[PDB]
A paper describes a structure:
The periplasmic ligand binding proteins (PLBPs) recognize diverse ligands and deliver their cargo to membrane-bound members of the ABC-type family for selective uptake into the cytoplasm. However, structures of metal binding PLBPs of cluster 9 family display a distinct fold wherein a rigid α-helix connects the two terminal domains. Towards this end, we have determined the crystal structure of native (non-recombinant) ZnuA from E. coli in a naturally zinc bound state. Superposition of the two independent molecules in the asymmetric unit yields a root-mean-square deviation (r.m.s.d.) value of 0.3 Å for 933 backbone atoms and therefore we are, for the most part, presenting and discussing molecule A. Structure of ZnuA-Ec possesses a pair of (α/β)4 sandwich domains which are held together by a long linker α helix that is tightly packed against them.
The asymmetric unit is composed two protomers of ZnuA (molecules A and B; 520 residues), and includes two zinc ions and 527 water molecules. The metal binding pocket in ZnuA-Ec is formed at the interface of the N and C-domains. Zinc is coordinated by residues His60, His143, His207 and a water molecule. While the histidine residues coordinate zinc via Nε2 atoms in a trigonal pyramid geometry, the fourth ligand water occupies the apical position. Interestingly, Glu59, which is close to the active site water, makes a direct long coordination bond with Zn2+ (2.8 Å in molecule A and 3.3 Å in molecule B). Intriguingly, however, ZnuA-Ec possesses a unique disulfide bond (Cys252–Cys306) in an unexpected location, between strand G and helix h. This disulfide bond is surface exposed, and is a novel feature of ZnuA-Ec, as it is absent from homologous zinc transporters. However, in ZnuA-Ec, which we propose presents a snapshot of the bound state, there is no equivalent water. Instead, we propose a “partial domain slippage” mechanism which stems from small yet significant conformational changes in multiple locations of ZnuA, which together potentially drive binding and release of zinc. In this light, we assign the present ZnuA-Ec complex with zinc as the metal “bound” state while other previous structures like ZnuA-Syn may represent initial conformational steps of the metal “release” state.
Author numbering: 27 to 116, 139 to 308
The structure:
């Protein structure tokens, strides 16, 4: 199997590995990449993986050690890909699985590695990469269209996970409650967010399923601000050939459900 650190990385891997090998995901649904320790059974999967795929040590630091022990031919470290370095945005935001362009680079790297590891599967791997890129292009056209009328509407997200996606599709967030969703915002920060929401005529605040939404709801009350929910880890999406496109589509729907 290809073992992916986080579900959306698993989504990309599962487009490319479909009908070639299985894809497994380390981080369970409901858990957060900002607050995780590997289980003994997580450590097992890694040593036995045909290929490991992760963002890198500035993201999933809990994986750096066992990953450093593997051969280079048995890993893809997304944030260190030569194609990815030029695309990193300000040091750098590591929420890379939400960048369609980084997703392509990641697909390419996975394809290359699997072609080496599994030469019998070259044709299917080639076809998979082809299909992935076609589907992604359609998805980007669709998502761009869905989000176009929402450009300029201000909102707050719970944590700073969405930058690549927002930049690609022209969404205009006013800010985030937290950088690390592990760190409690503080009351001062919370009334300041509300002032900004009210003053700058924001339309939404967004909770996330991995974190209790109490604080998001508290900031909204009194105001005209609607509450939505964004899931940066695609919990409700099953791994599979079309999962990545489904993920980007669902995220777009989550923004639109509130912002429209
Ligand atoms: Zn995050």
């Amino acid at each position: 199997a290809v073992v992916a650190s986080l579900k959306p990385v698993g989504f990309i891997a599962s487009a490319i590995a479909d009908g070639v090998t299985e894809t497994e995901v380390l981080l369970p649904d409901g858990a957060s990449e900002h607050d995780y320790s590997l289980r003994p059974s997580d450590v097992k999967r890694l040593q036995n993986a045909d290929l490991v795929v992760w963002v890198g040590p500035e993201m999933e630091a809990f994986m750096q050690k066992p990953v450093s022990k593997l051969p280079g031919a048995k890993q893809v470290t997304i944030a260190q890909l030569e194609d990815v370095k030029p695309l990193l945005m300000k040091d750098f935001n590591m929420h890379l699985w939400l960048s369609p362009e980084i997703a392509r680079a990641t697909a390419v790297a996975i394809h290359g590695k699997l072609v080496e590891l599994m030469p019998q599967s070259r044709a299917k791997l080639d076809a998979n990469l082809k299909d992935f890129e076609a589907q992604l292009a359609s998805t980007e056209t669709q998502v761009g269209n869905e989000l176009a009328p929402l450009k300029g509407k201000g909102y707050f997200v719970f944590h700073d996970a969405y930058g690549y996606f927002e930049k690609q599709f022209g969404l205009t967030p006013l800010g985030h409650f937290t950088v690390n969703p592990e760190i409690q915002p503080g009351a001062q920060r919370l009334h300041e967010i509300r002032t900004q929401l009210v003053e700058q005529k924001a339309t939404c605040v967004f909770a996330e399923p991995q974190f209790r939404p109490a604080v998001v709801e508290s900031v909204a009350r009194g105001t005209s601000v609607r509450m939505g929910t964004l899931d940066p880890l695609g919990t409700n999406i099953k791994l599979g050939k079309t999962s990545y496109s489904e993920f980007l589509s669902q995220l777009a729907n989550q923004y639109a459900s509130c912002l429209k």
